[PDB]
Amino acid sequence: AGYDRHITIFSPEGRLYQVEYAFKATNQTNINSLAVRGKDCTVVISQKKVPDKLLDPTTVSYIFCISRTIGMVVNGPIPDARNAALRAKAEAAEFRYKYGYDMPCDVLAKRMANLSQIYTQRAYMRPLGVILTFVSVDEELGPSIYKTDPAGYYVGYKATATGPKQQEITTNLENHFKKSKIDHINEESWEKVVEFAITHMIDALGTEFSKNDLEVGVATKDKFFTLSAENIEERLVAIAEQ
Amino acid sequence: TSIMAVTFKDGVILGADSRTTTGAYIANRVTDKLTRVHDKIWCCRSGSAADTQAIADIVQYHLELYTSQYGTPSTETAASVFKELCYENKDNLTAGIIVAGYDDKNKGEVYTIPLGGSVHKLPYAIAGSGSTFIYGYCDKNFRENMSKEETVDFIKHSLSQAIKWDGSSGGVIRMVVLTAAGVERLIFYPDEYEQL
Amino acid sequence: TSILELGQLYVTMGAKDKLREFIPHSTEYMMQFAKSKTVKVLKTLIEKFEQVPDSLDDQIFVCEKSIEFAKREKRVFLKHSLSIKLATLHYQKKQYKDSLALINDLLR
Amino acid sequence: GSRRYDSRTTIFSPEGRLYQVEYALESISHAGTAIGIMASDGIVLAAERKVTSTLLEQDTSTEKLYKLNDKIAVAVAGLTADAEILINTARIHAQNYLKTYNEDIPVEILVRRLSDIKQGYTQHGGLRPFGVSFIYAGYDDRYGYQLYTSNPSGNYTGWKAISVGANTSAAQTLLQMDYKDDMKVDDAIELALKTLSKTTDSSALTYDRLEFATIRKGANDGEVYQKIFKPQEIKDILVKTGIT
Amino acid sequence: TDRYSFSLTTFSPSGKLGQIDYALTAVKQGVTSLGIKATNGVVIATEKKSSSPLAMSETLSKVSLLTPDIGAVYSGMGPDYRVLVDKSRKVAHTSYKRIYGEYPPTKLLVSEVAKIMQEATQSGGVRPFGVSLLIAGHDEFNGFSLYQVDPSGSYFPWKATAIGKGSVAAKTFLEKRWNDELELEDAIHIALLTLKESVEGEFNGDTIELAIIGDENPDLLGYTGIPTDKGPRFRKLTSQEINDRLEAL
Amino acid sequence: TTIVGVKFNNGVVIAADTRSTQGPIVADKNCAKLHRISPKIWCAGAGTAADTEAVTQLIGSNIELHSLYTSREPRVVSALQMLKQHLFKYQGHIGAYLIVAGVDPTGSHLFSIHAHGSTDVGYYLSLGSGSLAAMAVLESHWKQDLTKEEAIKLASDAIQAGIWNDLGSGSNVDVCVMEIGKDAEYLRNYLTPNVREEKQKSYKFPRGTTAVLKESIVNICDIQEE
Amino acid sequence: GYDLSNSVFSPDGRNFQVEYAVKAVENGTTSIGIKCNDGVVFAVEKLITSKLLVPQKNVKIQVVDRHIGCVYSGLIPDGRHLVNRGREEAASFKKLYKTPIPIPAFADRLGQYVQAHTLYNSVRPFGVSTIFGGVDKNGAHLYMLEPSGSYWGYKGAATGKGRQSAKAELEKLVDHHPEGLSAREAVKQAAKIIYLAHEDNKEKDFELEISWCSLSETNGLHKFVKGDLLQEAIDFAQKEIN
Amino acid sequence: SDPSSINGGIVVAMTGKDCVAIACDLRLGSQSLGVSNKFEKIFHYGHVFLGITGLATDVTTLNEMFRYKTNLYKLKEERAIEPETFTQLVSSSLYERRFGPYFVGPVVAGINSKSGKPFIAGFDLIGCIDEAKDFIVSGTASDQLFGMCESLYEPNLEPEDLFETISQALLNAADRDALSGWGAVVYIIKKDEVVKRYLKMRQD
């Protein structure tokens, strides 16, 4: 039939082209992120762009607070970003209620993952075109980053980046942990991990940043906070004085 | 059972007595009734141990989900989750729940919610079976915005009359302090409050 | 645990007559072991013997005896492994006519 | 939207005919042969496996042969997944009959019930058929030994000799010439074997590629011994008939 | 509304079902996994793969546990495997650990999961899961058993088999390498050696995932002082144990 | 039927007895009332027998399914919660009285759940029918900071004195000592109360004493062969 | 075909349907939202089709709750469904939590409803743009909601035909007043740029409707500007454009 | 008064060595009237034996319910269903008729044929796995039975002596019962063969 990729049906090549089309639509906000594991923290930095002077700059955001321990960073269209932010919130209430402790990030990776499969198995549900980066600090697994993607595939990371220019970032992170020879930076405080992160991003993307063009989210132990433009301004001066 | 909360200058202090009976036999006399369902909005359970516990989870489920979508809920707001659920299970279940919280705007507030489900703003609240004895002591001796140490010894003297006369209450007196500073635990042993 | 440290016993060692002797008694020990991981182990004892020269004759002898057991007690895999090493002892001692005949016969 | 992309495969053709039923019948001659031959003393069911590999385990396999109850077993030929389902539907039906009347099901009744199940899928609901063909060997006292084939449309006819699956036309011609009304079970076993030796879709015909099973009156006191043979008992009776 | 309840799998004019013909190709576009059945045990071994090398691989599982005696391993799609492992477990508890209060035999577990594939072949709003599973397990009464469940919903027992993209070559290698009695010690060396002809990748314990349904381990019991039950017969092999065997090939 | 659980800061001991009753008749002389929700979470049950056993099955399944999807080891608090909801929707018509004892990646634990949906905390709990008698013993000889060697004596003697002050109690004391960082230790029949007194006469009878009015033979072991 | 619906995907990241919904909103009349210090001020250009009409007797600004103004452009009937839905959702929240709904909460809700209409075969994504705001107790906020389910904070937003004239003039107003302006002073500003936005629409004649929600004029309720205050605005603008 | 006591009847089951025995009385009537002695209360499914007491209707409905499941087991698994998982099966079907309880008492008796080890198990009402390896008693005169069994039994008997013991344990108990007195069957069950001997027992 001429219908063969309107629905989530295999091709002669044995493939789901429909699902592939989601991954070509995870790059429309053209924002880039990089997220690195310290020793006792996790740090995730993303670009901010406003297209006009006439928006309010605060509300423009891509780093969405899910649990009070699990941050979530979104690459791809903001309509499907929100639908992804909501579902996740729903499961976080749901886990505490029935199991009597806060949701582990690890478990949020599989639930939201299995849910993604269910959208590519119904022949009437269009998958979310958002790559989610989940950052956390767990006590049972330590600092972790889990990346889910529109297929429902996922794996763990030692560091990871996402975005259309994200190849460039992959060079910086690969070279960096090649020299350290370990999966995590030996640094005992979140401050200097924000300082490191911004440095590889300046190298990779080739442009230096400002306070109003950054957006930073930090997972510490037992709380998840986002830093404001003022706290980000402090960090930038201290890269220069290293 | 005997619980109360009473406002003060910088917030509220919440107070309870930790004896928990089934019939004549105390099941456990160290059992806390002071419950965190949000981290600045605490509550005090009474009536049947089952009934209140189930309600405290379902109310936790709805303030967790509030805080992730719309920011932290006010004390006013948490009381209204309790209200409408007590409404549905008025005849099915029983509860006494006194809802006490710190807000960063209007300071500390105390709402009281009987078993039928109604809210009533008040500067002080008593509930349990410890509270039909101590009624008169609480109202003669109260003045709003009293110093912190005066609150501490009032709730103490109040709860020492509750344990003295009602035998359903007892154990340690515990308190939770909601302030700008944070959440601070107090505990007073039997040998302390009998003198005081 | 016992076989790996019996490997030090046969050959390490410093060039002796006892080293010589010890390798023909390693093939005797092989037959007692009689299991799957005997096959891999045998080859390495033989390599250490090769590495340090101790009696021309005797080297060729131990390989031949092992190829005999390698079709009767142990499987096919052993026999061609040992046969490559027999080919190597021939070519290095510069017997090219023997090494050729050996190679051709394998290789169909 | 949805109505646009709707297959509509459960409508009649201009011929009045159901394309998907025929397509099901087309695909079962791509699965192995299963034959039933009715002797007067028993029933031989002889199936040729549609797979074989020396790395296959085909020894715990009963991948064509199923017991529905201890008196009625089936030979299956077609898409095995669809077939598995009906097999536990059938068990559920047998046990139901047994619950309510406290008497085993006659062969007439269970064959009518499976057939009505099939009928529903081709009749409506926009589904595709369950492409399976069953050869039912069974014993009941009321009509004795009874042999049956049903097809994916959901229609049944009784037979004295039948073949299903691969080379249906071929096996039929042979059966007609070498049948006799009354045989012993052995003569039947022989004939079962002989037809599969001339129809085999590989030149060779072997025990490990035969599933073979009978129901015999060699149980005394007028009872029927359902026997699914071990492949080492198949090996001897195949040397007996002199094939191998 | 919705009106996807019409089958999306239909017979083809030439016969055979198109959608299951498509799904099987997909299994040979995947990773490679194999299983060898020994006399006294069963082994499965597969490759671990990720997008980038900076991704972990200990937080990913392609040998998964159904029961303490039964593991599964796949070749095909990662997303499609993940959901069916969960459903495999859910049906194993609800229909056999509630009604017999114990774990199901391997044949009985196989069959349950074959129904789930089956309704992904029948009805609307489903297309087949694109995996082939091996289900090796042990039950007491038929001993060691190895199965293969395919995209179509049939099952097959085998004596040794492989699935994935390097499949046609791998079963040829294992044809001469299979023996009538093979020990589990010997088998472990075999599976590694076959999957070494099939994998180019840097060959450590950290990329080759090994799991055995060997023999019972009373130390993975989790309790003591009960001599009546015995521990898991499954035992997932972590990187260190495979590293010794690397050196012994 | 009595349950003690004794939390200490090294582990936890939970002990209960093997006499089950169905009214004044003793239903069973040994039955294991110590159930394994999980390997690391053992509970015991008092109260209605047919309701304890069956609901350790429900949650045993549900906790294993859960742990497999989380790929982390169970919480104790997970067991307690599953039970709580389940009991409460029947509104106390399942009369489960459990002491849910367990080690986990948070440490040693001891919880209680009662037959209405009520849950209590403590480092010593006592529950069940013979509770009252075990409770009395405990408070005199307890202190916090026990070892496993202190704790195991105190619990087992409270169970032994519960026999001798209750009529539902009796027969063998089973104890399970679950330490942190170890496999749980089912020291069954830690304390024998008493050995059954030797009777003074053999009562095995002559053969052919009874009469047989008719008989027949059926072997259901086989269906009629070839 | 892959250019026809919403559940389809195409390998350009386009999902052609949704983009076509903006083209509906582009046939609408100008609607502006002026974000002031004290609240929000909406105005809508209302075309007078014929002299047969009964004047000032159609409201294109409909209230939701008692404190959230809502004005929409695109398909007029289609928009009326979206507002009815946000009046249900406001009423559900008012009951369950006994307070008037926050505006970031009202945002979540509506946002979800239109996003929903891109994931099923049997629905069409609504082609309307909304502009909604008011005063809640966390302060005044304003949101514009795209038919794609995209939205942001805004110090001034617009949509409609004369979104071309209106936008340039809103830049002018944040550079006039970059420390903001009063809600009273802003009545005269909404008149001025609605009048200028009828020089892309001068084939007809029109009526100006102005409504406000500001704390300091209306006690935080969504009211209409009416009587003599409304004609002062009309005169002001009328004389500038002459 | 209560349903189970209307219909009467008793079941006794006692392990020996390498063997077991299950036995019943065959009275089955309602209230005063004895109606039938042509009613057996021991049923079997392969080599698991199930005798059952209490309400006469729930006897005959568990006979059908259990039967249907042990068919599905035999066809699927292709081996007979073992007594040890049959015990779990009994618990689970009762317990889901938790509310609307069955007023019954199953007594499961069998031999694990893979070790030769004798196995008994009990139930009353809606569950309760009455473990023993000595005996299980049920029915409306469990008191009578219970006395006979606890004193007579010496562990690990010979099958012939197990027959003497169980014949007595039913006989004396039954005529100090008013809900029994009509007939009796004793199944001596070796792990290779099944002897049924109907005893002589005086009429009520």
Short mmCIF file of C-alpha atoms in Angstrom, two decimals, chain A:
data_model
loop_
_atom_site.label_atom_id
_atom_site.label_comp_id
_atom_site.label_asym_id
_atom_site.label_seq_id
_atom_site.Cartn_x
_atom_site.Cartn_y
_atom_site.Cartn_z
CA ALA A 1 0.00 0.00 0.00
CA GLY A 2 0.98 3.64 -0.31
CA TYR A 3 0.35 3.70 3.47
CA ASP A 4 3.42 2.27 5.02
CA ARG A 5 4.89 4.99 7.15
CA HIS A 6 1.69 6.83 8.17
CA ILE A 7 1.43 4.15 10.80
CA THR A 8 4.19 2.37 12.77
CA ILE A 9 4.66 -0.40 10.46
CA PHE A 10 7.96 -2.12 9.35
CA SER A 11 9.38 -1.48 5.90
CA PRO A 12 11.01 -3.97 3.50
CA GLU A 13 14.23 -2.97 5.12
CA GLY A 14 12.68 -4.07 8.41
CA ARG A 15 12.68 -0.54 9.90
CA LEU A 16 10.47 2.07 11.63
CA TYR A 17 11.07 5.17 9.50
CA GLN A 18 8.24 6.82 11.44
CA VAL A 19 10.23 6.65 14.64
CA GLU A 20 13.50 7.95 12.76
CA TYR A 21 11.41 11.00 11.69
CA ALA A 22 11.02 11.80 15.38
CA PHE A 23 14.91 12.02 15.74
CA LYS A 24 14.98 14.52 12.83
CA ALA A 25 12.69 16.75 14.92
CA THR A 26 14.62 16.78 18.15
CA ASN A 27 16.58 19.70 16.70
CA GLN A 28 14.22 22.58 16.06
CA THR A 29 14.87 24.77 19.15
CA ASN A 30 18.64 24.18 18.13
CA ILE A 31 19.61 24.40 21.76
CA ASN A 32 22.50 22.49 23.03
CA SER A 33 23.25 20.95 26.40
CA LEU A 34 26.13 19.24 28.01
CA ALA A 35 25.90 17.63 31.36
CA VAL A 36 28.82 16.32 33.43
CA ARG A 37 28.96 14.28 36.70
CA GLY A 38 31.23 15.82 39.46
CA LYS A 39 32.14 13.64 42.40
CA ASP A 40 29.26 14.45 44.62
CA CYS A 41 26.98 16.50 42.24
CA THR A 42 25.64 16.61 38.72
CA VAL A 43 25.77 19.85 36.54
CA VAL A 44 23.90 20.54 33.27
CA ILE A 45 24.34 23.75 31.26
CA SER A 46 22.11 24.67 28.18
CA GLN A 47 21.95 27.62 25.86
CA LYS A 48 19.15 30.33 26.12
CA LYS A 49 18.03 32.31 23.12
CA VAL A 50 15.12 34.78 23.00
CA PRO A 51 14.17 35.88 19.39
CA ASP A 52 12.82 39.23 20.37
CA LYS A 53 13.22 41.82 22.95
CA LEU A 54 9.46 41.61 23.70
CA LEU A 55 9.44 38.27 25.63
CA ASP A 56 10.06 37.95 29.31
CA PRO A 57 13.45 36.32 29.61
CA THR A 58 12.84 34.40 32.86
CA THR A 59 10.01 32.19 31.57
CA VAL A 60 11.91 31.04 28.49
CA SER A 61 13.28 27.82 29.87
CA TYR A 62 14.11 24.26 28.90
CA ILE A 63 15.15 22.89 32.32
CA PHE A 64 11.97 21.71 34.00
CA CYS A 65 11.75 20.69 37.64
CA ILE A 66 10.09 17.18 37.88
CA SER A 67 10.92 15.85 41.28
CA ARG A 68 12.83 17.90 43.88
CA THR A 69 15.71 15.61 43.02
CA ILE A 70 15.29 14.94 39.38
CA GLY A 71 15.81 17.70 36.91
CA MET A 72 14.92 17.24 33.31
CA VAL A 73 16.55 19.13 30.32
CA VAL A 74 14.65 19.11 27.01
CA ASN A 75 16.03 19.16 23.45
CA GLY A 76 13.39 19.55 20.80
CA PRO A 77 9.98 21.39 20.41
CA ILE A 78 8.47 23.03 23.50
CA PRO A 79 4.83 21.64 22.90
CA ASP A 80 6.09 18.07 23.31
CA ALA A 81 8.51 19.27 26.03
CA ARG A 82 5.51 20.17 28.25
CA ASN A 83 3.63 17.01 27.55
CA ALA A 84 6.77 15.19 28.69
CA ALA A 85 7.13 17.46 31.74
CA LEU A 86 3.51 16.63 32.75
CA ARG A 87 3.54 12.82 32.38
CA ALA A 88 6.76 12.69 34.46
CA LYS A 89 5.20 14.73 37.22
CA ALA A 90 2.35 12.27 37.29
CA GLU A 91 4.60 9.33 37.80
CA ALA A 92 6.57 11.12 40.51
CA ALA A 93 3.38 11.64 42.62
CA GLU A 94 2.40 8.06 41.78
CA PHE A 95 5.70 6.42 43.05
CA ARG A 96 5.77 8.09 46.50
CA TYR A 97 2.15 7.20 47.05
CA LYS A 98 2.46 3.43 46.51
CA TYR A 99 6.06 2.64 47.53
CA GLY A 100 6.59 5.18 50.29
CA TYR A 101 9.86 6.79 49.04
CA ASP A 102 10.65 9.35 46.42
CA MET A 103 11.01 8.31 42.87
CA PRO A 104 14.53 7.13 41.79
CA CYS A 105 15.76 8.71 38.50
CA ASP A 106 16.69 5.15 37.31
CA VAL A 107 13.03 4.05 37.60
CA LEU A 108 11.86 7.32 35.82
CA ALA A 109 14.11 6.41 32.93
CA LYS A 110 12.30 3.00 32.46
CA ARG A 111 8.73 4.34 32.99
CA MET A 112 8.92 7.19 30.65
CA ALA A 113 10.84 4.87 28.33
CA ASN A 114 8.17 2.11 28.23
CA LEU A 115 5.60 4.79 27.73
CA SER A 116 7.51 5.94 24.62
CA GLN A 117 7.27 2.32 23.17
CA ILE A 118 3.53 2.39 23.68
CA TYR A 119 3.35 5.50 21.53
CA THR A 120 5.18 3.76 18.66
CA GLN A 121 3.06 0.57 19.03
CA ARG A 122 -0.27 2.29 18.70
CA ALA A 123 -0.99 3.04 15.19
CA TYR A 124 -2.57 6.35 16.09
CA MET A 125 -0.22 8.02 18.63
CA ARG A 126 2.63 10.15 17.41
CA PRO A 127 5.75 9.96 19.43
CA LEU A 128 7.17 12.93 21.41
CA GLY A 129 10.02 14.47 19.47
CA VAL A 130 11.98 15.29 22.64
CA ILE A 131 15.23 13.82 23.87
CA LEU A 132 15.12 14.07 27.63
CA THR A 133 18.24 14.27 29.75
CA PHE A 134 17.52 13.28 33.26
CA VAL A 135 20.02 14.49 35.85
CA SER A 136 20.08 13.32 39.36
CA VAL A 137 22.14 12.54 42.39
CA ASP A 138 21.11 9.14 43.85
CA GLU A 139 22.65 7.62 47.00
CA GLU A 140 22.16 4.05 45.85
CA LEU A 141 23.72 4.49 42.40
CA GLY A 142 25.54 7.78 42.92
CA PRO A 143 25.40 10.67 40.49
CA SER A 144 23.84 9.52 37.19
CA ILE A 145 22.61 10.99 33.89
CA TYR A 146 20.04 8.91 31.97
CA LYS A 147 19.23 9.81 28.44
CA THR A 148 15.96 8.64 26.91
CA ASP A 149 15.21 9.36 23.28
CA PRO A 150 11.89 9.15 21.06
CA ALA A 151 12.29 5.47 20.51
CA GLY A 152 12.36 4.52 24.17
CA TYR A 153 16.00 3.33 23.96
CA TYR A 154 18.18 4.50 26.79
CA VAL A 155 21.59 3.92 28.34
CA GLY A 156 23.58 5.51 31.15
CA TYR A 157 26.31 8.17 30.59
CA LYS A 158 29.46 9.38 32.09
CA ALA A 159 28.80 12.69 30.46
CA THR A 160 26.60 13.46 27.51
CA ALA A 161 25.54 16.31 25.34
CA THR A 162 22.47 16.76 23.02
CA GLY A 163 21.74 19.34 20.33
CA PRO A 164 22.47 19.69 16.58
CA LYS A 165 26.05 20.83 17.10
CA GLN A 166 26.50 18.16 19.86
CA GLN A 167 29.25 16.32 17.80
CA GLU A 168 31.55 19.12 18.68
CA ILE A 169 30.86 18.65 22.40
CA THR A 170 31.49 14.92 22.07
CA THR A 171 35.08 15.77 20.98
CA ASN A 172 35.64 17.87 24.12
CA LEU A 173 34.21 15.34 26.61
CA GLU A 174 36.02 12.34 24.94
CA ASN A 175 39.46 14.15 25.02
CA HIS A 176 38.81 15.34 28.59
CA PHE A 177 38.07 11.95 30.23
CA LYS A 178 40.89 10.40 28.09
CA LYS A 179 43.34 12.58 29.98
CA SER A 180 41.68 12.09 33.51
CA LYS A 181 41.25 8.33 32.84
CA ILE A 182 38.09 8.15 35.01
CA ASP A 183 34.41 8.72 34.45
CA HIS A 184 33.88 11.58 36.78
CA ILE A 185 35.80 14.64 37.78
CA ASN A 186 37.35 14.56 41.22
CA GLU A 187 35.96 17.73 42.52
CA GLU A 188 34.11 17.98 45.89
CA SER A 189 32.03 21.04 45.25
CA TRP A 190 29.41 22.04 42.69
CA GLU A 191 30.98 25.48 42.04
CA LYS A 192 33.97 24.32 40.15
CA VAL A 193 31.91 21.85 38.14
CA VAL A 194 29.84 24.80 36.77
CA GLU A 195 33.22 26.44 36.02
CA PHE A 196 34.55 23.35 34.07
CA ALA A 197 31.29 22.79 32.12
CA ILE A 198 31.10 26.33 30.69
CA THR A 199 34.79 26.06 29.59
CA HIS A 200 34.19 23.04 27.28
CA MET A 201 31.15 24.68 25.84
CA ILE A 202 33.02 27.91 25.07
CA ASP A 203 35.65 25.70 23.30
CA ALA A 204 33.11 23.59 21.39
CA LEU A 205 30.48 25.96 20.30
CA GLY A 206 33.19 28.54 19.56
CA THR A 207 31.29 31.45 21.26
CA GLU A 208 31.72 32.92 24.71
CA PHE A 209 28.49 33.43 26.70
CA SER A 210 26.86 35.99 28.89
CA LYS A 211 24.57 35.91 31.89
CA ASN A 212 21.33 36.26 29.88
CA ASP A 213 22.29 33.70 27.22
CA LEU A 214 22.97 30.86 29.79
CA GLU A 215 20.61 28.60 31.68
CA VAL A 216 22.08 26.41 34.33
CA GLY A 217 20.56 23.69 36.46
CA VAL A 218 22.39 21.87 39.22
CA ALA A 219 21.51 18.68 41.08
CA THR A 220 23.19 18.46 44.47
CA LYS A 221 22.50 15.94 47.23
CA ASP A 222 18.90 15.92 48.17
CA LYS A 223 17.74 18.99 46.46
CA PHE A 224 17.56 20.22 42.90
CA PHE A 225 17.92 24.07 42.34
CA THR A 226 18.30 26.28 39.26
CA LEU A 227 20.74 29.13 39.51
CA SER A 228 19.52 32.73 38.40
CA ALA A 229 21.47 34.98 35.95
CA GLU A 230 23.20 36.73 38.84
CA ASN A 231 24.74 33.49 40.24
CA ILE A 232 25.73 32.50 36.72
CA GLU A 233 27.49 35.95 36.33
CA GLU A 234 29.86 35.14 39.22
CA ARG A 235 30.83 31.84 37.72
CA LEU A 236 31.93 33.43 34.46
CA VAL A 237 34.47 35.76 35.97
CA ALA A 238 36.21 32.92 37.83
CA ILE A 239 36.96 30.95 34.62
CA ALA A 240 39.10 33.99 33.53
CA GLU A 241 41.07 33.96 36.90
CA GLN A 242 42.01 30.31 36.84
#
